[PDB]
Amino acid sequence: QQKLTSPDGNLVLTFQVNKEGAPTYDLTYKGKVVIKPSTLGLELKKESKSNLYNGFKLKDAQTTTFDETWQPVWGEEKEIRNQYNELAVILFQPMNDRSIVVRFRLFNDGLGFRYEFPQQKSLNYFVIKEEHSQFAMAGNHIAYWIPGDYDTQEYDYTISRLSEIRGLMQQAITPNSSQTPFSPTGVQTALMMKTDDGLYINLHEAALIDYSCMHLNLDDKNMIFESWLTPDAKGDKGYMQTPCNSPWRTIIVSDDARNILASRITLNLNEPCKIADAASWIKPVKYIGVWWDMITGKGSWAYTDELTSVKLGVTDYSKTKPNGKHSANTANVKRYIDFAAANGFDAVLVEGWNEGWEDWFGNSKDYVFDFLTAYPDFDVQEIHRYAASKGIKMMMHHETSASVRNYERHLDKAYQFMVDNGYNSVKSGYVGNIIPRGEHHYGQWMNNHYLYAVKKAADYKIMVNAHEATRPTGICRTYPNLIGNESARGTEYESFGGNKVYHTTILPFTRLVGGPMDYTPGIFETHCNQMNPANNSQVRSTIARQLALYVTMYSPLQMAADIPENYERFMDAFQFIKDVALDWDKTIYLEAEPGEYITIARKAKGTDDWYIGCTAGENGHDSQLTFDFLEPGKQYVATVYADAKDADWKDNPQAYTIKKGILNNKSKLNLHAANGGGYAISIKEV
Amino acid sequence: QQKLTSPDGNLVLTFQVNKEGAPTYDLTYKGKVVIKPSTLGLELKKEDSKSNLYNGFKLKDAQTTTFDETWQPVWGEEKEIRNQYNELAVILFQPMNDRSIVVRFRLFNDGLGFRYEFPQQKSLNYFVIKEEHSQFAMAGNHIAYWIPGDYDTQEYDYTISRLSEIRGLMQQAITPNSSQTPFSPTGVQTALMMKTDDGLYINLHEAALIDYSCMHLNLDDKNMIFESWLTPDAKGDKGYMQTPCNSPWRTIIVSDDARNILASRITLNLNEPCKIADAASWIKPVKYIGVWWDMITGKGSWAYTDELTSVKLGVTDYSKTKPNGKHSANTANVKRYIDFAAANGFDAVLVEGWNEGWEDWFGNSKDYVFDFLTAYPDFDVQEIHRYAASKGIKMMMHHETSASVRNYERHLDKAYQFMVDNGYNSVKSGYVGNIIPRGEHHYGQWMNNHYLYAVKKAADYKIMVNAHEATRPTGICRTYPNLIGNESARGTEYESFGGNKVYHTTILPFTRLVGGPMDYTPGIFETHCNQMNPANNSQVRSTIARQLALYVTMYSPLQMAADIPENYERFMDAFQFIKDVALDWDKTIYLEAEPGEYITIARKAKGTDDWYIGCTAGENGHDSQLTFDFLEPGKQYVATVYADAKDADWKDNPQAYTIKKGILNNKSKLNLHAANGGGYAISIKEVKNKS
Ligand SMILES: C[C@H]1O[C@H](O[C@H]2[C@H](O)[C@@H](O)[C@@H](O)O[C@@H]2CO)[C@H](O)[C@@H](O)[C@@H]1N[C@H]1C=C(CO)[C@@H](O)[C@H](O)[C@H]1O
Ligand SMILES: C[C@H]1O[C@H](O[C@H]2[C@H](O)[C@@H](O)[C@@H](O)O[C@@H]2CO)[C@H](O)[C@@H](O)[C@@H]1N[C@H]1C=C(CO)[C@@H](O)[C@H](O)[C@H]1O
Ligand SMILES: [Ca+2]
Ligand SMILES: [Ca+2]
Ligand code: NA
Ligand code: NA
């Protein structure tokens, strides 16, 4: 039996090969079982060689320590400490004359482990049939979960016992453009859990590279989660060549929910930055967009309503009749540029700028876009000239309609077109079933594609925000030009019937573990019927809570998603969106309970200014704030953006108060969050 | 109810919708049934009745028109091709699904082409083909010259059998290959060649295979009906379609004279006209040698080093590896090939194994297998370019993909730019192994898109393409004449892997060569492979004279002399035919042809009065009584006959040949005997302009 302890001594891992030769581990935190005895291993595709899960012998083992500090290009703080004790075990399989290494890294806030496959005579090329990584639970915990799916993460969270997942799964799987649920007890990572004995446990992975995306399948009789990888077109779960490594599997654990949010285990298990000049060109982006028009149905992506279908290079759009709904027209874009410039925004996104949108949805169309040819009413050169004159950058849009070979064929030309026309950031998308047909969004094949697009973008000094991509696993450390994904249910679904009131009190515990989200907050007119009378969707938020998301939904990429006209009605509240920073020297998690409330204070990078947000669930929240994180002796202008006493997400969402006063490190504030409400505070040094 | 006749009146097509509403056609030739009543149509993938595009049709309208125009190939068997047909177009309406299709029939003096057309309409836009149900109902139990139906290889020896015997012979006919997916006990590939008991020759094939899955044939051996069997994708579907769109043409070439099957240009005539405006200014035939046979025979390696199990490109440091002393693609060795090419008037030298990755290329389903850009330490790209240019030689680029197709596409613009930057204007590509993306086949719609994408992009760089393991050609060279080659059949390489059947080159022109030329790589003089590699006991099933014959009987604008220079140096008298023979022709005459037995062809070298003749013979040899009526009255010629010696034989005495020079004219007569697996070659050079 091998033993490993955290630097602070509070976590203990034990490892042994069991009587069947199965590698086994367990984990305790302050004397409480976190992971019961759990087996590790893989089954390989047949060409006893299929068995890489038992008949192992422990040949050697070592423990080492590591302690270094590094600086993110952008992040929640200036400096991250990477401190762990490491156990490496060398496991030999006599029957197959081959060895693997299992590497365990134990931090004060949890455990990472991975498989390593050394180059040897009897292990070179192999295909994974299944990974059999176990996470044996000590009880029937509360879980905050979305359905296990190879193609979408755009689901509302369910809060239930592990025993209740099976019964709730059918109702949890709501309609989506591309979805492949795999099990009645299948869930996605990161999975958040709360134990009856007062522990918070997060199960996830780190550095998902050259490998298939991991989901979890629950054995709900023994309460064991098992790794369930995403299959390819032939049902296989990864083409490997030694030397190679699995991604890390992570268990983040604390008796304080705030320490789950504070964990940097995911980033710490990724390889250091591989972009030498990163600081010189990678910058956070605050943006508005020609976007909400089309999401609500007020406007169209399409130029014309005249065409049943289109053939790019044959269809002559100059001979088609404008539908009068096409939001991506030069005059309209210039009005967005004016509003962006007046209010200190960095960029304007425009969607529907390019030929093809008439056919974009659900046709499995190969040649669906060229990412190069503007519609007749979108003047790329004039918009570039005008934006540049107002100190604004345009954000490029590359919806692929999940036609991935087509995107790859155009990708160098599309990136060159961006550079030639003054675009340095792109929002990509993968809406529809993947082409090549038979592949899923999160398979090894597509994971390669998403990273290929990011690596190539880095060579062009382009920042990437990829919607519908595999959810992040901390690769932003290695490639910091990946400034965003959606890869979860965003504000767009507030237009498609609504998100659960508690949604933004769960995402920071689940989706945000591994990288930021382009959540597109800032909807002030929460009734979608004001954009489109046929749309009766209502945003499950107060205005004050929308302001809070600029602090509680961390991202270097922040949209103000509403139309300028709606911001002009509430410019007093809009001041918080104008003021709030995108990048931070320090973050303090003041209050956190998944599904109930999140309160975060952040120090704007290079300043002594602080920003606070609180987001609350179905029953609201009461905060008793203290400000001992402020500098002794310094006075601050505090602006509190709060729910009015009669505010409510459903009955009275636009009821807010704004109060300015002098604050210091001795100040105390008691604040009430409405149901689906919250508050925002700017704290600017005098 | 609808009738169409050939321009000359010898062929009659009838079309009617049968009682089930199934479109039906038949074909007669000089009063003989060629195609019995045969149904047409498709089954579509379910999103009940909408899946049915095979019956419940009504004949809505029809017209007959005539067409007669002549066009000039960039390269070909003749200067001019006549495109003359009568056309029947039928509009077929399906009331139950409120949609129409068009079936278009083109009837020539030498056979029939038909295709489906899917017009843009309210009720037909995006659809997926489950199966095509194009029937070819045979009049009898014909002799067929066939290879196994397969989604991934055509590298099979031919079988000659009755249609009734195909089922019993299929298992024996499927030999081991790097990538193969046979689909049916009675599945065969196209072009399929047949000989009837009532004196007819019938060829079944397709033309203009674009944005569609490759067609094979599946035999109903109880009713003797062949049916279209398309290549499935990774999900088992057989084509993603968007109206307006067309199927490829399906062709029935028929004559009572086997020579008229070879003479048919129906395949080329059914392709769209040339889309490369400046084609003549840069597309040129290529005669080449190669650093190649060394590696095929096992004498040399593609690999730089023997020290590595596997490689990681960009990590593996080849400057730290030991040269294996067998690596043929080294600067000094390549320069010696350039010297031989330059001295003997060849256009190009192919080099394989020039680039990092060959230590770890074969049958691993490896994604990042090659970069098409980084030379081995012993191959100086820049020095070889300078040296080749100084000797008036072009280097032919090699892009083996190891069937890793996304990887090739990601590199393709950079790889073509690298070619242009370093003076390469032609590329031999390859797709050895199971396709990546995994689940796709070599001949599916997905890969057909890839191969044509590679050709279209090459055209923009003024690059000519020779693609091994690609879908077999269907006349697209008319549209994109920079496609100067495919293998896409069993080539000379298999003469190193145990041998080709003696009769192989008497069948390929009736089958594989219908739709475009083959890079067959003829010209092996040292037919015992154990002289290259003692461990290799394979023998080429040929005499030397028959190897010379293939430069005329295996038509291609791309011709390799495949042997090593030192082997040619031992038989330079015979090598003179390979030096002299043209690559491009103003006229071709098929003098003698019987599939599986013998082919004799005369060709007039483009822009000249010079003629070249080849005869290739099967297991029993052949006797020719040649006449020369095709020569110009009054003109005298120097004829050089390269023939089998009296005691020549492919197995027992393959290197026994004679060379006889004499004066020839249009009244000359020559009686020649081809040995078993033998043949002959004749250069006929007009006396005044002789060189
Ligand atoms: C625009 C949106 O379309 C799809 O959303 C559908 C929902 O999945 C369904 O539940 C149902 O309500 O209909 C919705 C509309 O068809 C798709 O699934 C989403 O992922 C998609 N969102 C992306 C598409 C865009 C266009 O390029 C972007 O504007 C947007 O920001 C993307 O996130
Ligand atoms: C080189 C050759 O390899 C494969 O051939 C195998 C045969 O299929 C088997 O029957 C058995 O005998 O082993 C042979 C060697 O492994 C493959 O199937 C062929 O298609 C392949 N030929 C191409 C490969 C090349 C390398 O790029 C070229 O040199 C050659 O011209 C290609 O045609
Ligand atoms: Ca989306
Ligand atoms: Ca081959
Ligand atoms: Na309240
Ligand atoms: Na004889």
Residue numbers in the entry:
A (entry chain A): 22 to 68, 88 to 726
B (entry chain B): 22 to 68, 87 to 730
Paste lines from the article.
The genes encoding BoGH97CSus (hereafter referred to as BoSusB) and SusB were mutated to introduce a stop codon after eight amino acids, as an in-frame deletion of susB has polar effects in Bt. Furthermore, BoSusB and SusB have similar substrate preferences. Our work here, and previously published work on SusB, demonstrate that both enzymes are exo-acting glucoamylases that accommodate α1,6 and α1,4 linkages and do not break down acarbose. Remarkably, BoSusB had a similar Ki (69 nM). SusB has been structurally characterized and is known to be competitively inhibited by acarbose. We solved a co-crystal structure of BoSusB with acarbose bound in the active site near the dimer interface. Acarbose binds identically to the SusB and BoSusB active sites. The SusRs are 89% identical, and the SusBs are 93% identical between Bo and Bt. Collectively, these data suggest that although BoSusB and SusB drive most of the acarbose phenotype in Bo and Bt, respectively, they are not responsible for the acarbose-induced phenotypic differences.
Species in this phylum normally deploy a well-characterized Starch utilization system (Sus) to recognize, degrade, and import starch. Maltooligosaccharides are transported to the periplasm by a predicted TonB-dependent transporter, SusC, where they are degraded to glucose by a neo-pullulanase/α-amylase, SusA, and an α-glucosidase/glucoamylase, SusB. Instead, we discovered that although acarbose primarily targets the Sus periplasmic GH97 enzymes in both organisms, the drug affects starch processing at multiple other points.
